[PDB]
Structures are given as C-alpha cells and as structure tokens.
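Task: complex structure prediction.
Instruction: return structure tokens for all chains below.
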Amino acid sequence: DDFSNQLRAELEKHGYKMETS
Amino acid sequence: YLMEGSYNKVFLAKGNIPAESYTFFIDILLDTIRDEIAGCIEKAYEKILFTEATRILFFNTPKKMTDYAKKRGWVLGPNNYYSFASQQQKPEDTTIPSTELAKQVIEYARQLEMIV
Amino acid sequence: LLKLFTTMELMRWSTLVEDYGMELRKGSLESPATDVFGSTEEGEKRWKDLKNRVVEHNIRIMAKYYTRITMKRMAQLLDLSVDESEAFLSNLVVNKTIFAKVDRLAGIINFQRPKDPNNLLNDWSQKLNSLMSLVNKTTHLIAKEEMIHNLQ
Amino acid sequence: TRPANHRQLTFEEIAKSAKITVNEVELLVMKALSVGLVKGSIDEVDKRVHMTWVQPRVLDLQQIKGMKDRLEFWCTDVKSMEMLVEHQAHDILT
Amino acid sequence: DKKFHGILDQGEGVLIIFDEPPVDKTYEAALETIQNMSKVVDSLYNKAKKLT
Amino acid sequence: MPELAVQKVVVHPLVLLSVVDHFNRIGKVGNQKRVVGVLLGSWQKKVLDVSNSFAVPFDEDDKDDSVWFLDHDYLENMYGMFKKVNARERIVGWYHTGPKLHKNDIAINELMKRYCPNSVLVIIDVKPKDLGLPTEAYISVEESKTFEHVTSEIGAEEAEEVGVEHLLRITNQVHGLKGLNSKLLDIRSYLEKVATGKLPINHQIIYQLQDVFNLLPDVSLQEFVKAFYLKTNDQMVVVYLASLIRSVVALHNLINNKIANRDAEKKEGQEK
Amino acid sequence: QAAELFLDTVSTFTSYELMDYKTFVTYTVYVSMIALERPDLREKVIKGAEILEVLHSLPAVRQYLFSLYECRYSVFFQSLAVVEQEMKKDWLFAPHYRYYVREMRIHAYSQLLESYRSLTLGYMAEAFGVGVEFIDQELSRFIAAGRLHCKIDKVNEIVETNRPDSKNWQYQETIKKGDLLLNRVQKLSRVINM
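Output:
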C-alpha cells in the first residue's frame, strides 16, 4: 500500500543502473 | 511426489519400507509413470531424437525402450515422429446450430410453461 | 466504339483511335444542318479527354468482373506503366466512383468491401426464398402434367 | 454428382483441355463473362475462377434416378425436427 | 493527436492502418442498461428491508 | 410478411360457404358433376375482391366431353337484376370444383373472356386437399392454357367478419414436411413414367431441381452452410445476451408486487 | 463523478472555511493528470489564469504536464517524488496510496507502448535508467490485469501489440459487470421469501 510507494521509489529514484552506464 | 509429476523424486531405494515388500510395488508404480510420460511426449514434441527419448524413459537399455515404441505403434527413424492437430466450429457444438435447435426447444418450453 | 466500353480490353482502343484519324479530329461536318463547332477545343485535345475516360471506365468494368486483381496484370490491361496506373487510381478513389484498396508493398488491388455478419445473413435468407419459388413452379408443373396426361 | 462443394477451379486444368495458354484463358473468361455465358468472379490471388452455375444440361436421365434418393433423405430430416416440437407444448407467439 | 488512427512501423519504415472500428451500439446498448439496473435494484432492497 | 402480387385475389368468406351450400342443395350431386358458377365482385386498380357469386346450372354429358349444355341468357338477365340491386357488382370470373382440370375448362373460359379479358378461375374443394388454404385461384388465357399462382387471402367486410366469429412455429413445420412429400411423390411418378414411355419429357422440371440442390437447406444439414455458419453463431450469441438482461429486469418488477401483497396481508391478519 | 465538479471554476473563491483557495487550485491539477488524457488536457486545462497559479507554486504545469503531452516514460521518475510529498502530508489523498501512483505510472507507459507497434523493450530498459527485471515484472503485472495487452516473449527484447478493443473484449466486460449484479439479486432473495 504505503510500503510499495516507498519500495518503488527507492528502486526507481535512486539509480545504480544509469550510473553503471 | 506422485501428484506433482516429479518422476525423479519417486525413484529411490532407501528407507525402512524399501526393505520389505516395496520391491513388489516398484514395477506397478513405474508403468503408470511411463504411460504418463508417453502421452506428454506426443503432445509436447512432434519430433525428437531417439537418444533423448531413451534417457527420458529412465530405462537403461535402448532395446526395451524400442519395444515400447513399436508397441505403441510409431514410425521411428534416427528421430521419433509424431503428429497432432485438431479442428472445431465445423464439427458439431452447442454453437453449431442443429444441436442448438434441439436445446432451445427445452429452454423456451420451460419459459412458457410446458414443463420439460 | 461505345459497345467497346462494355467489353473493354484497351489494346483495341488505341488501334481504333489511331485508325479513325479523321473522325475524332472532326467537329466539322460534311453537310451542316444547324450544328457547328469548327474545332474550337482542338480536335486533337478530344482524344486525351477520351483517353483518361476509357481507362477509368475499364477499371469500372474490372471492379464488376474481378474481386482481386494484381497490379502487373491491371497495368498490362491498361497499357500504362505500373507507376502511372497507380497515379490514375489514386485520383480516381478521391473522386468517389469506386472502392478499391491499394497494396503497393506486394502489388495487389482489392475491390472488396469488409463483411458484416448481417451481410452473410441477407444471402442466406434469399436462398430460402428461391426454394419457396420452386414449390410454386412444381404446383404449376403438376397442373400441366395433368393436362398432358388427359385433356380431359 | 453430390451438391456443390465448391465451384473454384484454376486456369491450369482448363487451359490444358482448351489447348490455349495460361494468358489466353484469362482474356477468354473475361470475354465469356461479358456475355454472361460465364457467371462467376475472378480471383487473382491463386489465379482461380469461381464459377457460378447456370447451365441447362438438357436430358439428365441418370442424375434424376439419384435425385429421387436424395430428396427422400431430406423428407426424413425435417420429420425429426417436427417430432421434438410436437412433444413439448404449443407454439403460441403470444 | 488522434487525428489519424493508424500505427507506424519504424522497423519497416512504413505506415500501416489500424483505424479499424468495432460495433458501437450493442456493447453501448448493453453497457447502459446494466449500470442503471444496478442502482434501481439497490434502492429496492433498502425500502423492502424496513431499514434504509 | 404476407404474400402479395401484381394482380391479387381476395375472396370473401361468404362466397366460399355459398358453394358449400350449392353442392348439397342442388341435389344433382351423386352423379359427380362439375359444380360451376359465376363469380361477381368488386375490382379496382389491380385488386379482384370477390364480393359476390351466383350459381349457374349446367348439364354435361357423362360419356362425352364435347357434349355439354350451358345458357348465356340466364347470365344476362340475372346480371341485370344484380345491377339493379347493387351497381358495385362487376363480373370477375368463375369457379369450378376441381380437383383435376378438364379440356372443357377451356370452353367455359372463352365465354367469360369476352365479358372481361381477366377471368379468374378458382379451384375450390371443401373436401380437404390441403390443411392450409384449400382454395386456389388461377387466371387463364389460352396460348396452351395458362395458370397463375396469384395469392388468395381472405379479406372481409365488417359484417361478414363478425358472422364468421359467431359460428365458431409448429403449424409451419407440419406444412413444410407436407410440401416435401408432394414433390417426392412427383419424382417417383416421374421415374415410373419415363420407365413406361409416358408424355413427360419437359425440360423445365429437371432444370429447377438442379439449382435448388446447389444451394442446400440450413435448418438441416451443414454441408454448404459450414463456411456461413462461422459468422452466424456470433450474431445469435449477442441476441441471447440481451435476453438475459431483460429476464432480471422482469424478475425485479415481480419482487415489488410480492412485497406489497405481503405487507397488505400481514397487517390485515392474513387472509389470501 | 469528481472530475465533473473539478472542471468547474466559476467559483474562483469561497468563504474560506469550506475549503481554501491555494489548496483547491493545487487539487484540481492533481486530479487532472490522473483522471484525464490528452485530448481533454489540451482542451480544458489551458484555462489561463489557473496556469499562472501552478507556476506560482510547486510543479504540475511543469513536470507532470510536459511529461503527459510528450508521452515519455524517459523523464518522469523525478515526479515519483511528488506522490511521497503530497499524499503523505494529506488526510484526503493519503487513504489512496499505491492505487493513485500505480494508475498514473501505467497511464504514461501505455501511451509510449501505443506509439510503436513493434517496440524495443531493450532501448527503454537501458536509457530510461531502470532495472530490466523491474520494468518487465511490473509489465507482466499490468498485462495480467487486462490494462495493457502487450504480447511479450521475455528472453528477447521485442514486444508486439494486438487489438485491446475488440468485440470479444467488449462482451467480456459486459458479463463482468453483470456478474456483480447477480449477487445483489440473491441478497434481496435472502431477506424476503419468508
């Protein structure tokens, strides 16, 4: 609910994919 | 294990029970699994290599595995051959109208009073 | 030449227009009644006006005759290059006298219209009407069959 | 020799019989079709002509014999439909 | 914009149709009659009940 | 829809009964003669409305089809009285009993022709040939003798209809089979005839059958139909969907009625 | 039902204890992005005076509006901060949580997918700066819903599309509402029929 908004955001927002590029 | 269709899990020889009379049972149990595997292999694969098929059946000798295949009545080669494919909405259905007409008579008859 | 439009294949067309090079430049008369022209338009111009008109008219006929036609055949019939034919067809669709679909990535021209199931229904109902019509013929046929059998 | 089950037939068989080439038959069917000797459509996706019958075929005698058995089959089929209707209630539109 | 409703194939660098239109009076007819019928059914229950 | 045509005949119920009455009353029956009469009525733009009739005597020979006796003068004088009674009574045609035709049918016709090119000939048998309408109308002019499958329906005037009432799918299907059987009889008959060298050699009769077969029926069979069918189920599927909805809607209105009946009863003391 | 009401702006103000002006202007736009799609936006949300106010405040006329018109899922992740910011502090929009965010993320994605029949999953997965495993797993979550209809074979990086609007689909939805109604009829049948 609330957990997924925080969960999606850490994954989406905080890059470790666009910084490995 | 039987429920799942996990053939591998089934194959074992250790326990208290394997000592006594489970020996008598093992054959019966295998036959059921092998029937189930043949029916899968025809649906899944329309062609496969012969050797792959020999491993799968989990019989050691190629020969018994050849015996079963002729028994089923398949053409063989270095490959195994299989063919299937079905048709519908042309052979009868409740949505092919002849059979419907008979079905609709009961529906409408209920509706108005009859009763059928 | 008018009857030619019904049958049209259009190789015979070029032959006729060329052969008749003294009728179709002729707005003039060999005995005037009250008609006049003098060839104002140019009589030469008229052949151009006919040339598009017969080619289009031919496409009208193909629509009835064929449901599918290939672009190479369609071009052979017109006697126009494949590029040229395409160009006339495009103009003709905007004009709104035919329906056709152009597939220029394979080279096929459909004149078909998409079906509706009701459409197939219509046809199905007619087949049954023909059947009734027969029963009438058969009734008339019995009446006949009696006269012949005994006058009486 | 049965009902129609199709009326699509391709150029190749006809052209052989006719002893004119594949190109010629297309032009020819088009001449035939103008007259309305041919009732049909031309399918240019497999180069086959779908025909629609209209031929007289005067004096059949043998076909007639067969025709008597086929009609007979037809009388029975409707009869079955009827039995079922009889059993259940009475058709009143109201 | 939806001023033209095909689709674009950039892969074969071509324009393809997709403007294809479904039926819009059976589905629409059927859709409207249920939503109303639901409101009506619910009301009737409250009145029936003896406690709205 | 009901079948309509270019010319049409409407025959009144009164007319028909009159023939029934003529057959028993003349008492000449039991010699098995043609019961023939002249029909009268009302005609307009292209509608025969058979408003009236009157019987005509006739005596025919019972061993000669060339020797028969009929009087013209009887027709004029009686016609004259009818004109005097009601002037909306024209000569439409005549009637014969049937159930078979005669050579002589041609002979009554030549006379009626003169009076009006269109003379309807109605074949009326009380004794039931047909379990639908047992009266069939033809219009005939000679070439040879023609026929026409002109519709026959029973229209009426206001009075006539009330009198009728004072005196007092499945129907489709029985009739449908009937028709099949009549044709079936004709084929067996044809085979027999051809076998025994009898006149039939008609081109038309073979010609009609062939086309008919090509089409096939679709209330039985699938053979020609199967391709069409694929569309067909999908349309039916939708009609049914509609039907479902409406049954709930109906069911609901019934609930409202019950609750009201319950309330009323309960408070009263309960009595149905 | 809200969108009907929200669109109205004759009543610029209030007597302020009913609601407040700043809140109400911020609220209309927020509801716009979720609730509406781009022929509606171009038409209504150019309202002029309203557009000034959003600039006189935190983004929406900015980041969300540009992203909707542009139909990109390239640059829109910065606005995933806003869900966190506004919803959490509020008492009105809190209750809504993942349904509000998730429906917005889908909306954006759907437009991009609809643009290219034959879409490269691969190009998106890298440049949009996202985990390969996240985009797919959530995509397959969305396809299962019937929200998207992108036909995927995951080991390859290629996706195709089919008709999401079809006769068969429309009939399914009609039955689907029909079922819920059926249950109500039973509940009625329960209480009465004594």
